Structures are given as structure tokens and as C-alpha cells.
Scaffold this active site. Structure first.
Site, mmCIF file in Angstrom:
data_model
loop_
_atom_site.group_PDB
_atom_site.id
_atom_site.type_symbol
_atom_site.label_atom_id
_atom_site.label_comp_id
_atom_site.label_asym_id
_atom_site.label_seq_id
_atom_site.Cartn_x
_atom_site.Cartn_y
_atom_site.Cartn_z
ATOM 1 N N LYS A 2 0.822 -1.202 0.000
ATOM 2 C CA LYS A 2 0.000 0.000 0.000
ATOM 3 C C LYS A 2 0.855 1.249 0.000
ATOM 4 O O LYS A 2 0.564 2.192 -0.714
ATOM 5 C CB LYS A 2 -0.915 0.010 1.205
ATOM 6 C CG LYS A 2 -2.298 0.521 0.938
ATOM 7 C CD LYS A 2 -2.619 1.793 1.734
ATOM 8 C CE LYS A 2 -4.144 2.013 1.890
ATOM 9 N NZ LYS A 2 -4.527 3.472 1.973
ATOM 10 N N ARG A 30 2.457 9.130 -5.915
ATOM 11 C CA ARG A 30 2.993 10.494 -5.666
ATOM 12 C C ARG A 30 4.159 10.812 -6.652
ATOM 13 O O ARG A 30 4.227 11.908 -7.203
ATOM 14 C CB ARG A 30 3.424 10.644 -4.213
ATOM 15 C CG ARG A 30 2.241 10.581 -3.204
ATOM 16 C CD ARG A 30 1.300 11.776 -3.330
ATOM 17 N NE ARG A 30 2.012 13.023 -3.107
ATOM 18 C CZ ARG A 30 2.136 13.600 -1.923
ATOM 19 N NH1 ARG A 30 1.581 13.049 -0.852
ATOM 20 N NH2 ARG A 30 2.835 14.722 -1.813
ATOM 21 N N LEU A 34 3.024 1.737 -3.302
ATOM 22 C CA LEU A 34 2.123 2.104 -4.395
ATOM 23 C C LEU A 34 1.819 3.578 -4.322
ATOM 24 O O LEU A 34 1.814 4.288 -5.313
ATOM 25 C CB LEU A 34 0.802 1.348 -4.308
ATOM 26 C CG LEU A 34 0.313 0.392 -5.353
ATOM 27 C CD1 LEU A 34 -1.212 0.370 -5.288
ATOM 28 C CD2 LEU A 34 0.745 0.804 -6.687
ATOM 29 N N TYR A 35 1.526 4.011 -3.108
ATOM 30 C CA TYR A 35 1.256 5.388 -2.822
ATOM 31 C C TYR A 35 2.468 6.225 -3.178
ATOM 32 O O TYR A 35 2.359 7.312 -3.730
ATOM 33 C CB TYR A 35 0.929 5.540 -1.353
ATOM 34 C CG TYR A 35 0.542 6.935 -1.026
ATOM 35 C CD1 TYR A 35 -0.781 7.321 -1.062
ATOM 36 C CD2 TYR A 35 1.498 7.859 -0.683
ATOM 37 C CE1 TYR A 35 -1.133 8.616 -0.775
ATOM 38 C CE2 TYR A 35 1.174 9.152 -0.394
ATOM 39 C CZ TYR A 35 -0.157 9.528 -0.444
ATOM 40 O OH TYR A 35 -0.538 10.803 -0.162
ATOM 41 N N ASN A 36 3.643 5.682 -2.888
ATOM 42 C CA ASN A 36 4.869 6.402 -3.193
ATOM 43 C C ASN A 36 5.037 6.581 -4.689
ATOM 44 O O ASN A 36 5.397 7.673 -5.182
ATOM 45 C CB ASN A 36 6.067 5.670 -2.573
ATOM 46 C CG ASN A 36 6.197 5.958 -1.070
ATOM 47 O OD1 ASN A 36 5.425 6.756 -0.525
ATOM 48 N ND2 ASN A 36 7.154 5.317 -0.406
#
Lengths: 137, 137, 140, 135, 138, 137
Positions: free
Chosen positions: B40, B48, B43-45
Site C-alpha cells: 500500500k 505520488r 504504491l502510494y509512493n
């Protein structure tokens, strides 16, 4: 029970206008139906309804769409900015069933009051498939 | 934010290998990149990351993926059953840049430690486009 | 009489009517079949009761259980006798072509149905040397 | 009597050099074994398993009737006889042929009811997706 | 015991294909990768292979890592070890590697589980393996 | 213990000389790199270093090699006799990556002092693949 079941039967009846394969031997998720707009609530019920009508599909939860273009080039929103417009995705193992589901959904919502009649849908195609995690119970 | 800009710089270098049209006069959201897996947070990284590298694209938030098939006959997961595997969607105005961004994302994560290297990606095509709302607010 | 059964029978009949193929031979031999499995036990049984009602020209096994297939990888494998909870039943038919028609019918029928009925699988099978099911005379 | 049949079969199977498994692992063939008596089929079942670790077996079950000996009336599709059967699943047609012969060859050397056992090869057009074992 | 019985199995089967097992060069350019089964069955197969074929060289048993986890989630570490064992046979010729693989597969095929669950593949070394020279210790 | 991390980076940089796929859709373990010699410790750190550089590979543990040929007329060693020379194997999904990793390991150790510079490596191929046991966490 409804609104879900009434939407479910509504779609089942329309899906039945076509004789098409819903699954493949491969089992791969290569097709999909991108459904958005209306309101959260109208999308929510259509989603639940879709799950009941099509046990062979897989559904994302509800989520929100980013914004699009301007005009007036001054400037565009960040790619991260989120609208209040919601969406969800339907994974399918065949392209042809995905067309049938698109038409089904388009035909079904056009007979409804707003906001449900403002719901938009399009087929999507995944070049390499989507490898949904397998389920082991 | 260190970890986000290192990612963006990664992507930029790679995207630079191929100067394809990223936008059309129509401004239509006809293509995309579907990113999932990993963890999670990785993926977010990456999400962004992509935001800072590519101002011509639009991104969903992270959401969850449903399960695919159960092996064998007998019980299959509900269409609504949700996994902990996350995904996000990148909207793009051209198919060729979708192909390029998929290649960039894949080439980038494979050289990275796990779980980032377990992120998957595929181009996706939208038969009738996706009408993302106009921004102003 | 048994709605769940007669509903299913009407389903099959509607679909079989798409193709009026030969269902019996003068020979009277059982050279073909349809292997029906998966789903749930009760959904499968229901399908078997419906098939009985729709097609007097076939013969049906009761339900029984399937063994396991392969275990993934190079490790231990299930014994040939190990039994799963997945059920199956077999349909004996006197023609290969009606066996094809019946498989399409079952398949088309369950794909529109809810889980677990939609998870029922089927395949034609054929018997190289026939199956000599015993002759029937009323006992009684 | 399980362990005499097992070897009865391995000795016949040894006449043939044919693959028993594929890389696909799909169950595309079977041997359909029936008749004799319940016990004679039961021992042969237990026996087949010992002889062939690569196969998978249905339990014993009962066969329905065929045609009426005359006029008739005809039996319902559901009526069950006292004749028994079991199925062997195999990953290759060629092995199925070899196991069919092995079984036919073995039983014809035994007393009744074992010599009255029948077997035929069966082929599944689409395979049979036996459930995977983890467990 | 169980070793010499295996050895005789392999012996009888290899006799089918009377191929060159050795080379003037004495280089180790091929192999046979034997795994699966159980640890004790694998071990018996290794001891039997040693008795049947003096022209080969064998590793001890050791363990296999895991392969792929399905789906797009977490994978096993490169270092994570399973309970599946393997050993390797070094051969001086590619054709005997083919034949020894054929013999091993043909032999376990006929055997009870877990022995029949042993898998085997030929392997090829691009630059050979320079196994150390042996001289009898003092 | 940072001994691992520096070899890790040592390899990551060499591997980066070549853009090749490390994985296939089939996912089959058909390539390998066979690493031996030097010393048990020199191999041990290279092993740990290797795992860190290539999350897509799989490693056997360390083990020892049998002997080869006698010098001269003398008696041969038995197929069982073990030397003190150690080895380990790297499973990979592509042949081309295996080559890349072979050059990287060769290029990396040739710059170090003994016994590390004595470490040897060859690519190997598996006619039928190696069916590594899948992992269910």
C-alpha cells in the site's frame, strides 16, 4: 433486497438479449467496464445490482475521479486533485461480454430518473490483463 | 518529500527516452495505465512519484482490488469481496504515451527492492473515453 | 410438482429445442455422456433432477464425490483415493451429437444463474467401447 | 487381496512404456470400470490406487439402467441398478488405453464375479477440473 | 538394501542407450537436477545413482527455495528455503545427461509415492564446472 | 553485516549496464547461475548480496561440491566424495538475465582480493525448468 435486486433483475434481462461467453479457459481479466457519474448513491446501487446479476465479474469499491482539462490554460489542476464524481470498475474475462454489460447498463439507466440517468459507462481493455489476487478458502 | 521526488526523477529519466505526444487538442481521456500490487505504501509512493513527473496525466486515489478466480470448481469469491492488494489508475490523452509510461514504470520498479519491484502495470484503453469533470474550484 | 426441478427442466427444454438432433439409436448403445460437476451439492442435485425431467432419453448416475487433482509443485500429492467435497454426476446418452447439444445447454443455462449454480462445470465425454448399462424390467 | 491385485496390475502395466503425466496436469482421460459385484470392484479399485499413484479415483457408485428388454416401459433416467462402477482419471489418453488393457487382461484370468468386470476408456472433450490439493 | 535396488534399476535402464559418458577433456559441462519426492527417497535415489554410475559426481542433498507466489502480492525472499530437497549430478557429456534423465524418470514412474513424485531435468553449464581435482589424502 | 549491502550495491550497478527482463509471464525457472569457489565466507556474503540486488531470483543455500578428475593414472574419486569447495545456485526466469548476472558477478569479484577473486561462475540452463515449490503466505 431492492433497490439492489430490482437493478439486478433489470440487468439480467438485458444481458439475456445477447448469447455471449462470460468466462474463458485462461481465466484472465482482460476486459472491463468503467462506470462513473450520477451520484455516489446511484453508483452504489448499480454496483450491488451488478454483483448479483453477474457472479462471474469482479468489482472495485467505489472511488473518486480526478479532474480533466480547463479551458483557459490557467492552469490545470494537479494530477492528484479529486472531484466529487465517483466511479467503479468491473473486471471481465471477455471483451464481448464487456460490450454487452456496457450496453446493458446504458440501456438500463436511460429509463431512470436523475441522478441515475446521468451515470456513464465505457468499455475498457487491458493490454496485459489485470492479475487480480487469487482466492484460496 | 525525498522518496517522492526520487521516484519522479526516476520516471523522468526513463520517459525522456521517448518524446511522444502527451496531449491532444481534443483533450480527451482515452488511454490509461493501471498500477497495482506491491504494498500500500510503495504504491502510494509511486502514485505520488507520477504526479510530480507527469503534469499532463490524472490519477485516482489508491483503492482495493477484488479477488480473481478460485482455483478449481466449487466456491468462488463474491464479485464484491475485496482484497488488501491496492491499485490506482492513470488517465492519459494518448495511447502512445500510455505505452511509454507503462514501460517506464515497469523498467523503474524492477531495479528496486521488494515490495516496489512486485508492482504490476498494464496499459488500458477506454472505448468511448472517460469524461473527467472540468476543474475550477 | 417440485418447482426448483420443473423450472430447471423448462430451462433445459427451451435450450435443447435450439437443435433437434438424434437422441437415440436403433442400436440402443450408450457411447456418450455428459460429466457434470462442481457448484454446490444441492445445486448439482437440483440440476440432476431437472435433467431427469427434461430428457427421458438419458440415464443418470447419482451424485458422488470427485477425488483431488494435482498438488502444485514437487511436493506430496493426494492419494488416488482421497476424496474432496466437490460432487459430480454423469449422463449417459446414445449419441455423441446430443451429448454436445446437452453440454451447451447445461452451460448456457447455468451461466445465467446465481452462485453456486453458475460454478457448475460440464464436459462431453465419450466411451470408446460403450457402456453396457443393465436392462430394466419392472420388478414390480 | 488389495496387494495381489496391485501387483497383478503393475506387472501388466510394465509391458508398456507410456507417459502417465503431462506438464499441463489436466485430466483429459479416464477408464470407466463397472460390473462384476460390489466387492469385486471395490478390491480392484483399492488395487488400482496402489498400482498407480498418478491416477485419481471416484468412490464406488451405482449405475442406472439402460433400455427395456422389450416394449417396454422404459426406465426413468433416475432409476438406479445394483450394478456398480468407478472412474479413474488420467492425464493422458495413451496411459488410459494401457490401463484399460491391463485391467481387462488381469480380470479375465480371475474367477467370477471378478471376470465379469467391464472397462472402457473415456475421453473428456474439455478435461475435468478436479479440485487442487494444498490441502 | 534400498540403494542397490535403485542401482540395479538405473543400470538396467541405462543399458538401453550405450552413449559416451566421458571425454578426453574431462570437463563437467552437463548435469541432471534431481528434486522433489521426500528427503529419504531422494537420498536413496542419490545413493543408488552413485553405485550405478562411477563416471558422475554428486552434490549432497540440500534444499530448494520457493518459486513464485501467485497474484500481485508479497513474494518469498530469494533466501527463503522450503522443505523440498534436490541434488545435482555432474556429467562430462550432454548425451548421457539426456539418457540418465530418461532413466531416472522412467524408474521413479513405476515406484510408490513419494519416490514417484521426484522430478528431474537436464541442465547445461555454459562454461563448465571446474570441480576440484582429487588426490587420496595422507 | 554491511558487508552484504556493499556487494548488493556492487551488483545493482553492474546489472544496470543492461536492460533486460528478469521475469516472464510463464514464470518458469529455466535459467540459473552456478556460483562456486573462493571460500565459504566469500560465497556466503556474495549470496546474501545477490539476494538483495535481485529480488526476482531464488537462491539455494550454500553446499559443497564433489571432486572432479584424479590427476593422472591414480584412482578416481567416488561420485559421493565431497570437497571443501562450496557453491550455490541462482534460479532465474530468463536466460538473458542469467548472462547479465554472470558478467556482473565476474566483473564484481575480479576487482577484489583473494579469496573472493577466486569465485567462479557459469550460466546454466534447465531443459525442462525447475518446478520450485510455490509459496502461499
Amino acid at each position: 433486497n431492492p433497490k439492489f435486486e430490482n437493478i439486478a433483475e433489470g440487468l439480467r434481462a438485458l444481458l439475456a438479449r445477447s448469447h455471449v461467453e462470460r468466462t474463458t479457459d485462461e481465466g484472465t481479466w482482460v476486459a472491463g467496464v468503467f462506470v462513473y457519474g450520477g451520484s455516489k448513491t446511484s453508483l452504489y446501487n448499480l454496483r450491488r445490482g451488478t454483483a448479483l446479476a453477474i457472479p462471474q465479474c469482479r468489482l472495485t469499491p467505489l472511488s473518486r475521479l480526478p479532474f480533466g482539462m480547463a479551458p483557459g490554460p490557467g492552469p490545470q489542476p494537479g494530477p492528484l486533485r479529486e472531484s466529487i464524481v465517483c466511479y467503479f470498475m468491473v473486471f471481465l474475462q471477455t471483451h464481448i461480454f464487456a460490450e454487452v454489460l456496457k450496453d446493458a447498463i446504458k440501456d438500463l439507466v436511460m429509463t431512470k430518473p436523475a441522478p441515475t440517468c446521468n451515470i456513464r459507462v465505457t468499455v475498457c481493455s487491458f493490454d496485459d490483463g489485470v492479475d487480480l489476487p487469487p482466492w484460496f478458502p
